[PDB]
């Protein structure tokens, strides 16, 4: 049986997106919260219709379609998908994922009837990744300098934000953050990091060391 | 009225796109005529800097979302 | 069955951390409040992702790992840990504590399935101590 | 039968290292040339003794030992090493790799007698990697800017050199080079790359595009 | 003479293109050598503002008509 | 059996490229000279690594890949390629042309073992055309 | 048998284009009038050479080529084109449409001999659409 | 003579290390006494900036190569 | 009174350390509270040059003797 | 039975340290003289408290602890230490060396009761080496 999401939660989430934006960590946390139970295509579609403006909604429809197509390629590449079945008669078409299949168009009850839980979780993960893409797209790390009057934790926050919310691969963020701590972060902290008797091999360790030995002023 | 919407000299592009898509979808057009109208309004409105930016697109943009993404990528930061 | 924490409480706690800071006694009391029931690694990880900024979150990940490693050393020093079992097949690896073990990565339901209550309370106490360390370090 | 390397080639390589340095691509090519046939520990040891100074030679001995230890760990992790055998009596100890085993100390003929070809190629690859490490160590990418009067190919050469000869993982060099082309490379070329009707997803493609559409001056 | 044609400081681009195409097609060149010559004369004549405008073309222009269209689109209105 | 090119000739060619440039007819003649015998992917790759700077080397890798792809399209368009065989089991993949196939990665001896002479001459002609393109592009 | 268009009509049409412009409805009506019978590539090419200036003629050649390419794509998408035949030996190449095929280059008589009526009407419609595009573009 | 080698005020550290290792290895010392002597000469020669740099080493350096690497990492670029 | 002891502008560091340790050990504090107090008084007294010298210690100093040794090593000779 | 050192000798040694310094060979000879019989931790501690100033005394406490720790590492590396015994129940902890063990804190009589002669000579040699280190460090 299908139960709709509360319009109160949806209104609060819409106002959160309206004030904080699409990319704030609080907004992504709220979306993850409302993305907890596996949603039917109807639910996610209406949710994005309400919380997103028209142009971000178009972008999100595009990105969701692309991610679902990648999922269906992986599904035809492995007959053991939690959305698939063992025989060929359970293969999942994009009409069934986007809610366009027979007995599902516009009807959430029938949708909830025919859909699999693996189908639901795959749709949900696809929608979350698409939301992340559109949020990163709607709104430069190598131009970030620590201002003469700025503290170090603010500079580290800004730099880690801009590096993690960028187009780098996940395996290239830590070395870039370290080498940006070393070359940015005006020459007092540069020399403080340079003359480190220990070898610092993690942004957290560098931050801890600098916070310990920083010039109180 | 959708056909009277222009991108202001100081207005950003996402605000203009929001306003235009709102006015086009909340109008008397058939559902199958909204995307072409939105595209052709992006091309003829949206003051001549973005007009030339869309004109000189090495790829063919056939969707309002794709046009918005392209313009947001290559827009003149100011 | 896993139940998420209210985003309203999380938003209020995030604004508390934003205005009062990390070290105020009211903030530590609020964290102790939201640290009442034993949380799964997913819950604590997302909570610290939301309430803490990027750099304090990195520091907190480091400190949480160190405290969990101390816990696992004490666990291999005593086979009667409430996270351990009697036989060697119940020994708890750090992949199971950090939520990285098999059947747990990204899935909170499976996490809640395989985890022990002693595991949960140890993870929770470790996260609280790590939060205290990072708060004392940030300012 | 052991044949020594020509002292003429060794003298030419030593003078190459003396004039060009340790890190020049011509020097690494020459080392790869003299590292073509599998060398015995005696050969590589004397070669590095002659071409390298005292302090780089100490560093190289350290690095060679570390790399050989990694090799021996991989060897005890796989009994099918081309240096190992099938039974336990053919397991290769570090005394046999460094030439310290019985019947090998100071004698290159006996060395060549008892050593395996897999042993020789493993020693050689280890020595090459150690040379690379020491060369990278003996002599910052995020501080590189394109000067007001500098051409773009010189800036690209300098940047790619500093990025590839750094501590980044191999899978993080291309995105960093691209994002440094975009944020460095003074605002004329910045706007030239920004207004690219096509999406450039490779440093070579960016270089080609900029060289085509650059302002001749 | 086609190789002596320059775009004057005050002359528009369509007049320069007309004059150049006229002088190139009404000359002693083979028919298969007119288009490359017209293109390379657009690129080297046509005073440095339009020279840089053609140089920084994100697309590759391989026809005099395409070059004329591009320049007419992105020209500095004055 | 694989024999490397002389580092003396390579050093002289590198200094020629350094003083005369990439596009001089003397430089192209010298490259044609050192491009006389069919080279293995290892040889051409190291040669271009040594004689070319970093950015021209990136451009040359791109151009070489494109030309090899054109060659492989012509090869799938004609089963009588001197690199191909008569049956389908001798069809030449780009991993075998770029030296990335199995038994070839980093090993020039195995490379010389498995490669065909038609493969070698096709790789060599492709590399020469790519060098010409990059030289025309750099200046 | 090929019959040329009257130079009197062509002179009147050229003066019409000279005074009224390319986009006036009277000019388009006159072009439709002189575009009544299916013309051979020679006829349309010379007509546009005479009535259009040099730069509009270049633009028109471009547009005509593009429209003919769209026509040939539709033709390879449907073997029942009035320019095509049933077998593969009657497929119409762009050299035959632009008048560049064998036995047609510069000779209008041979052109009229080998061309199909469907070919002629397709060429004519393509030229008319190209003229419309160039007229909309010039002013 | 190894015991008379000092790092000049303008000399770099790699040149000083080269000269010192040369003079120590080409001397009358036993082979088992060269490394400790090289280390203790790095510590007492090598003008007081590098002396303090080696003194305040959070790790214990027990090899001339390790000392050279540490000093090259944390040296005052000038 | 130990909590009123400051390092004078012209006073050396060993004299200040002697005076401070004397006043702290000859006071009413418990024996288990003297070392932390001496350390935290070294850190907050001992005028800002030595304060920054102790602050930027790559190693963690957990004893008055270790702090004294470190400061005596890296002190500004004047 | 514990017998204290003469305050006259201690006063003379303190004045020697005051006039000649810590590093003079006469001062080291005098210390070796008063370091002849194996002293209990109480004796050496009070002796260094009296003859050394506050800062040298702190340095000496540090150095003495480090040297005693090296001694205890050598002791756990060899069960035949003259301070150790044969069974594991005679292993000597640092609380017993520094005089901090049970029945020894502040009481020299009980100290002399429970301590071994090997313990005493090890403590004495450690204290002498620590004095040498501090003397070399102070000036």
Curated annotation (Swiss-Prot), chains A, D:
The record marks 167, 179 as: Involved in capsid protein dimerization upon acidification. It is found in: Virion. It comes from the Viruses. Residues 42-50, 103-114 are annotated as: Involved in capsid protein dimerization. Coiled coil: none annotated. Self-associates to form the irregular polyhedron core composed of hexamers and pentamers, that encapsulates the genomic RNA-nucleocapsid complex. Assembles as a tube in vitro. Binds to inositol hexakisphosphate (IP6), which allows the assembly of the polyhedral capsid. Homodimer. Homomultimer. Homohexamer. This is Capsid protein p27, alternate cleaved 1. It comes from Rous sarcoma virus subgroup C (strain Prague). The lineage of its organism: Viruses, Riboviria, Pararnavirae, Artverviricota, Revtraviricetes. The gene is gag. The chain holds residues 249 to 468 of 701 of the full protein.
UniProtKB/Swiss-Prot annotation, chains B, E, H, I:
It comes from the Viruses. Disulfide bonds: none annotated. It is found in: Virion. The record marks 28, 40 as: Involved in capsid protein dimerization upon acidification. Homodimer. Homomultimer. Homohexamer. Self-associates to form the irregular polyhedron core composed of hexamers and pentamers, that encapsulates the genomic RNA-nucleocapsid complex. Assembles as a tube in vitro. Binds to inositol hexakisphosphate (IP6), which allows the assembly of the polyhedral capsid. This is Capsid protein p27, alternate cleaved 1. It comes from Rous sarcoma virus subgroup C (strain Prague). The gene is gag. The chain holds residues 391 to 468 of 701 of the full protein.
């Amino acid at each position: 049986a299908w139960t709709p999401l509360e319009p109160k939660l949806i209104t609060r989430l819409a106002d959160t997106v309206r004030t904080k934006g699409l990319r704030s960590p609080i907004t992504m946390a709220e979306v993850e919260a409302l993305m907890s139970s596996p949603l039917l295509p109807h639910d996610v579609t209406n949710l994005m219709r309400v919380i997103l403006g028209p142009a971000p909604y178009a972008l999100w429809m595009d990105a969701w379609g692309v991610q679902l197509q990648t999922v269906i390629a992986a599904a035809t590449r492995d007959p053991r998908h939690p959305a698939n079945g063992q025989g060929r008669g359970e293969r999942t078409n994009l009409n069934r994922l986007k809610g366009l299949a027979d007995g599902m168009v516009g009807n959430p009850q029938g949708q909830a009837a025919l859909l699999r839980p693996g189908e639901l979780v795959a749709i949900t993960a696809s929608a979350l990744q698409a939301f992340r893409e559109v949020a990163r797209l709607a709104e430069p790390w190598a131009d970030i300098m620590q201002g003469p009057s700025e503290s170090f934790v603010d500079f580290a926050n800004r730099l880690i934000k801009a590096v993690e919310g960028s187009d780098l691969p996940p395996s290239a963020r830590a070395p870039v953050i370290i080498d940006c701590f070393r070359q940015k972060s005006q020459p007092d902290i540069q020399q403080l990091i340079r003359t480190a008797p220990s070898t610092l091999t993690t942004p957290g360790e560098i931050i801890k060391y600098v916070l310990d030995r920083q010039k109180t002023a």
